[PDB]
Amino acid sequence: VQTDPPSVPICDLYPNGVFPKGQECEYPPTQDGRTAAWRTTSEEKKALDQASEEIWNDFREAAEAHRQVRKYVMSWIKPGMTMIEICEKLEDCSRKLIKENGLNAGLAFPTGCSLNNCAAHYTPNAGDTTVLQYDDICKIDFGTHISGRIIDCAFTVTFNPKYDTLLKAVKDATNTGIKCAGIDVRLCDVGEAIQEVMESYEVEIDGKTYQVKPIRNLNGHSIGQYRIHAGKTVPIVKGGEATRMEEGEVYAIETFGSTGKGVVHDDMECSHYMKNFDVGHVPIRLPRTKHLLNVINENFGTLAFCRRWLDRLGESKYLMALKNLCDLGIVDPYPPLCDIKGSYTAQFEHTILLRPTCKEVVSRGDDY
Amino acid sequence: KVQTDPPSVPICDLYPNGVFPKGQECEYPPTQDGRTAAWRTTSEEKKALDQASEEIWNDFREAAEAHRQVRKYVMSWIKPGMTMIEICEKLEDCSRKLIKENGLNAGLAFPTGCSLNNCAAHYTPNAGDTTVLQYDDICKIDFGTHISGRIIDCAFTVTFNPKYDTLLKAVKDATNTGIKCAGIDVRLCDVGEAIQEVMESYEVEIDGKTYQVKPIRNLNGHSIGQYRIHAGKTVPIVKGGEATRMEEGEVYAIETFGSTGKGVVHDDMECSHYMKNFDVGHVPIRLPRTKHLLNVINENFGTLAFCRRWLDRLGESKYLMALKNLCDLGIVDPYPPLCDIKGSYTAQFEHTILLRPTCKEVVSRGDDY
Ligand SMILES: *C[C@@]1(O)CC[C@@H](OC(=O)N[C@H]2CC[C@H](N)CC2)[C@@H](OC)[C@@H]1[C@@]1(C)O[C@H]1CC=C(C)C
Ligand SMILES: *C[C@@]1(O)CC[C@@H](OC(=O)N[C@H]2CC[C@H](N)CC2)[C@@H](OC)[C@@H]1[C@@]1(C)O[C@H]1CC=C(C)C
Ligand SMILES: [Mn+2]
Ligand SMILES: [Mn+2]
Ligand SMILES: [Mn+2]
Ligand SMILES: [Mn+2]
Numbered sequence: 001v002q003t004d005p006p007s008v009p010i011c012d013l014y015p016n017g018v019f020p021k022g023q024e025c026e027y028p029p030t031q032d033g034r035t036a037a038w039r040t041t042s043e044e045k046k047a048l049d050q051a052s053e054e055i056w057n058d059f060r061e062a063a064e065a066h067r068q069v070r071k072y073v074m075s076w077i078k079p080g081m082t083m084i085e086i087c088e089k090l091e092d093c094s095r096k097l098i099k100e101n102g103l104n105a106g107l108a109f110p111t112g113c114s115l116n117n118c119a120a121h122y123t124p125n126a127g128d129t130t131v132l133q134y135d136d137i138c139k140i141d142f143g144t145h146i147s148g149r150i151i152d153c154a155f156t157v158t159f160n161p162k163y164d165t166l167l168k169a170v171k172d173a174t175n176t177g178i179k180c181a182g183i184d185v186r187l188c189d190v191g192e193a194i195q196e197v198m199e200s201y202e203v204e205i206d207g208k209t210y211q212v213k214p215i216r217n218l219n220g221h222s223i224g225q226y227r228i229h230a231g232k233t234v235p236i237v238k239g240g241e242a243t244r245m246e247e248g249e250v251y252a253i254e255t256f257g258s259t260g261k262g263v264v265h266d267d268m269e270c271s272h273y274m275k276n277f278d279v280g281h282v283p284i285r286l287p288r289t290k291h292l293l294n295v296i297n298e299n300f301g302t303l304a305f306c307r308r309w310l311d312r313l314g315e316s317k318y319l320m321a322l323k324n325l326c327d328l329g330i331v332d333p334y335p336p337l338c339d340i341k342g343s344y345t346a347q348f349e350h351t352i353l354l355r356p357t358c359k360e361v362v363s364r365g366d367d368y
Numbered sequence: 369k370v371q372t373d374p375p376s377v378p379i380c381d382l383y384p385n386g387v388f389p390k391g392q393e394c395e396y397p398p399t400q401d402g403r404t405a406a407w408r409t410t411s412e413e414k415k416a417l418d419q420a421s422e423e424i425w426n427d428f429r430e431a432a433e434a435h436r437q438v439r440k441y442v443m444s445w446i447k448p449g450m451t452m453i454e455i456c457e458k459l460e461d462c463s464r465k466l467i468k469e470n471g472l473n474a475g476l477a478f479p480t481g482c483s484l485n486n487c488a489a490h491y492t493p494n495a496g497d498t499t500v501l502q503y504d505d506i507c508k509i510d511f512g513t514h515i516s517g518r519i520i521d522c523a524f525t526v527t528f529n530p531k532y533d534t535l536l537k538a539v540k541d542a543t544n545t546g547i548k549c550a551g552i553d554v555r556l557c558d559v560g561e562a563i564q565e566v567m568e569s570y571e572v573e574i575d576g577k578t579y580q581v582k583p584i585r586n587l588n589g590h591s592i593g594q595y596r597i598h599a600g601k602t603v604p605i606v607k608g609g610e611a612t613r614m615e616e617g618e619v620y621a622i623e624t625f626g627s628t629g630k631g632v633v634h635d636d637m638e639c640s641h642y643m644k645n646f647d648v649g650h651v652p653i654r655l656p657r658t659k660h661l662l663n664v665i666n667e668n669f670g671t672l673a674f675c676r677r678w679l680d681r682l683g684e685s686k687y688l689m690a691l692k693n694l695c696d697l698g699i700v701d702p703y704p705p706l707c708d709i710k711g712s713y714t715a716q717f718e719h720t721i722l723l724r725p726t727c728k729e730v731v732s733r734g735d736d737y
Contacts, residue, residue, distance in 0.1 A: 009608070011586045016635050054630075054709075100608030101585045102568055104631050147630060298568070 006072050009099035010064045019060035022353075022362035027182040036183065045356035052248070056353060056360070058146040059250070062108075063351070063362045065097040065144045066151045070367065077157055079134045083124040086132060087111040087308070090142060098144050102298070108143030108150040109228060109304035110272055114336065115139075119215055119256050119264055119345040122336040123271045125307040134159050137166075139347040145303070148226035152252040153363040154349035162205050166346050169201030169212045170257040171368060174348035177220070177234070177253045178361055183354050187243050191235030194255050198236070203259065205344065213262030214255065215345065218337065223250040223351065226302045227277060249354045260343025267338035273322065273331050274304040282328050292321040293330065304334070375441050378468040379433045388429035391722075391731035396551040405551065414725040421617070425722060427515040428619070428731050431477075432720065434466040434513045435520045436734045443736070446526055448503045452493040455501065456480040456677070459511060467513050471667075477512030477519040478597060478673035479641055483705065488584055488625050488633050488714040491705040492640045494676045503528045506535075508716040514672070517595035521621040522732035523718035531574050535715050538570035538581045539626040540737060543717040546589070546603070546624060547730055552616045552723055559614075560604035563624050567605075574628060574713060582631030583624060584714065587706065592619040592720065595671045596646065618723045629712025641703040642691065643673040648699045661690040662699065673703070 002008050011017050027036040039045050049056075073090050090111050100106040114122040115136050124130060132138060141154035156167050176197040180190045194214060201212040220234030232243060236255045245251065275296055284290050295315055296305065310318055325331040339345055348368060353360040369384060371377055379388065396405030408414050418425075442459050459480050469475045483491040484505050493499060501507060510523035525536050542563045549562040563583060570581040589603030602610060605624045614620065644665055653659045664684060665674065679687055694700040708714055717737060722729040 007610070009586075011632070017586065017632065095608050098608065099585055099604070099606060101564055101583060101606035101631070104582055105585060105606075105608065 002068065006068050006093055007096050010061050010068070010097055011099055017057075017061070019057055019064050021060065022063055022360050023364040025179075025359040025361065027359055028180060028185065030184040031186060031189065039357050042357065048356040055149060056355060056362075058149040059151065059351070059353060059362050061146045062098065062144040062149060062151040063153075065094065066142070066153050066363055067365045068097055069093050069142070070140070070155065070365070073140065074367070077132070079132050079136075079159060081132050082128075083113050083130045083132060084128060084308075086113060087123055094142065094144060098146070103148070103226075103301050105146050108145040108152065110306035110309065112141035112154065113138055114141070114345070117260060117341055117343040117345060118268065118336050118338045119218060119258070119347065120337045121272050121334050122268065123306050123308065125269060125271050126311050137163050137344050137346060139345070141347065141349060143228070150223050150228055151351050151363050152223065152228060152254075152349060153351055154254060154347050155368055156346045156348065163344065163346070165201065165203045166205070166212065166257060166259065166344060169198060169203065170255055170346040171348045172201070173198040173214070173236070173255040173257060174253060174350070177236070177255055178350055178352060181245060181251060181253055181352055181354075182359055183245060183247050185245050187232065187234055187245065188238070188240040191240040192238040194236045195238050198255065198257055201257075205259065210259035212257045212259070215258050215262055215264055215339065217263055218256045220252050220254045220349075223252055228274070228304060245354060247354055247356055251352050251354070252349055253352055254347060254349030256345055256347045258339045258343055258345045260339035260345070262339070264337035264339055266335040268336045270333045270335040271306045271308070272304055272334040273306070273326075274334065275300065275302050275331050276329065277302050279329055282330055284328070286321065286324065288318065288321040289324045292318050293325060296331070371437065375437045375462055376465055379430050379437070379466055380468050388426055388433055390429060391432055391729045392733040393727045393729050394548075396728055397549060397554070399553065408726050411726065417725040421724075424518060425724065425729070427518040428520065428720070428722060430515045431467065431513040431518060431520040432522075432732045434463065435511070435522050435732055437466055438463045438511070438513075439509070439524065439734070439736065442509060446501070448501050448505070448528060450501050451497070452482050452499045452501060453497055455482060456492055459509075463511065463513060467515070472517070472595070472670050472672075474515050475513075475672075477514040477521065479675035479678065481508060481510035481523070483508045483510070483714070486629060486710060486712040486714060487636065487705050487707040488587065488627070488716065489706045490641050490703045491637065492675050492677065494638055494640050495680055506532050506713050506715060508714070510716065510718065512597070519592050519595075519597060520720050520732050521592065521597065521623075521718060522720055523623060523716050524737055525715040525717065532713065532715070534570060534572040535574075535581060535626060535628065535713060538567055538572070539624055539715040540717045542566040542583070542605070542624040542626065543622060543719065546605070546622045547719060547721060550614060550620065550622060550721060550723070551728060552614060554614050555611050556601065556603050556614065557607055557609045557611050559622075560609040561607040563605045564607055567624070567626055570626075572628065579628035581626045581628070584627050584631055584633055584708070586632050587625045589621050589623045589718070592621055597643070597673060614723060616723055616725055620721050620723070621718055622721055623716060623718030625714055625716045627708045627712055627714045629708030629714070631708070633706035633708055635704040636707040637705045639702045639704040640675045640677070641673060642675070642700050643703065644669065644671050644700050645698065646671055651697055651699055653697070655690065655693060657687070658690045658693045661687050662694060665694075665700070
């Protein structure tokens, strides 16, 4: 049985390391209006599903860790904690529940805790004195992996009830996206469905009424092994690509709602970085740059990381080396993404598997 | 009194004054503040605490000397073409003689592991197993001895094909690294970190494919207590294991497992290994055959691990339903073979260490490993 606080690894909580299934769903009709209810009992597909069970079960492990960590977080997170203390406490728990081991099992990406008008890609760097406040709207977006099978899953934390209708709107939009996803479904059609739900909500906050806007330049995304962004984008507005979702793909279905302009730009200090896949052996002159790349290779590979995570490894005076890797195309920065000052943004996100026999919301909990 | 070839003289008769050989003794690693632990070596207070437990250390050392002599003998004859049953019976017959087996007073601490290939741990043949050791096999010989419930848990990997040499080197280095990192007040996950750093640093090319050597993340070393092979602390072989600290006077099995596969094990094949749980002390029993099987386990094994071959040789038959019964009642636990993916290769090295007041003793160290 799990400790309180959690300390027992998921791999030791389940007989023979067979982990709980998420929500399983029949596929929605395609554009032609056909149901694929045949998948459910097709023997071809049942076999094809079983053939990748090892993969689905790894996703499930990482999903169960996600659920336990987030319930733990949901038991202590409060105003007056530093964002640093929040992320450290969450991440400490994640490492223990996933029984982290270098690139074999671990944290898939930094703990997002984006506040207020900032929608995504904020985590504190060293020295950040930001404190979580009663009237903050905080997007907790964190990830776990087993063998590079990533869970990307997120929710919004608040303490003031005035944000309740905003959270309801985005939760609805995300659940709509999840319901509309399936094999042979066009990516644009998911985006259209999300937008029509999102935009049906108007919220009143501090005596002002706002039209809930989808953040039009934020997206969900396909996931591949060690590759958080595998190259298909899931729009959250109408008019995305006609590309179809395909059997065996894995998607992060996420939506963002704003009371602001409904669009993000780069803002505040960068915390998040990630080595690029495509890039080959670009030559490196400087010792500090070579060293930083070795630390990145050993600890992260192609997974996202943050400055705090380099600090905790004993790295120092690495910022110009990090800039050097960025300039060389070896690493990309991912700065915080913000709507206008004074706006409010909310997010919900799950990871779904497009298994040959059903759609699995592998990260679904009793919470969201 | 000198040892025969094959070995036949009990260790207790080979050292007729009853004082058995020390293992490798080592100074403790520096504390996390960077300070030396060398004061323990010459501390009068630590020397006295050490000597108050000399009876205990000395019983481990007789068990360790038996282990050394058995495994040397095993290495002199183990070869392809022998059955796994032949290997285990030959090993076990020697172990019994050298330890001077007598009930729970002295004996075999647990069944002879001889896990093959993708199987990492907890395989021993049952009756009727026709498995033959092959040139291409990678075999983990993991066997234990005890004197008065002072257990030696110690293991090595047997191969005949040089293609596995680099995997064996990685795992031995990892184990030796773990042994070196161990000490009083050291966190168990820090031992795991040192180990994982060593395994990470190896790649092996087998059958034309290059593999990253992975620690088996869901396997651990463990603390040892009297007649208690797993005394409740785990020594992870990865960073992400428990933060709990090692303590003075504890005994650990420091073992590492390396894999070319996923780095994770699952249950597979027929279960051979079983062991009575420590606390289940008056869970009442209604079926006679079950009550008899328990009596036999109590008399012969107590809380030490056993296997089905060791019930067979006691003249017990038709007991699988009763053993399942003891399992279902929570009196006994099964320990099925633990195996990475088909076609993967797993290796292991293990030693027993004593966290003595004055020094760390690698009690089961030999000239072999
Ligand atoms: C971090 C991420 O998941 C947030 C949602 C997605 O972000 C976008 O849609 N990003 C942009 C694109 C450029 C634009 N000027 C502004 C908005 C998602 O990308 C689809 C993000 C993700 C997966 O890129 C990753 C990297 C992962 C991490 C840095 C943790
Ligand atoms: C036999 C044993 O020494 C092999 C190494 C250890 O095994 C594990 O760590 N097993 C895991 C496997 C996954 C599971 N979720 C949790 C346990 C070791 O355990 C520490 C094993 C040992 C000591 O369990 C004992 C029993 C001893 C015998 C059966 C001989
Ligand atoms: Mn996310
Ligand atoms: Mn995402
Ligand atoms: Mn062992
Ligand atoms: Mn052991």
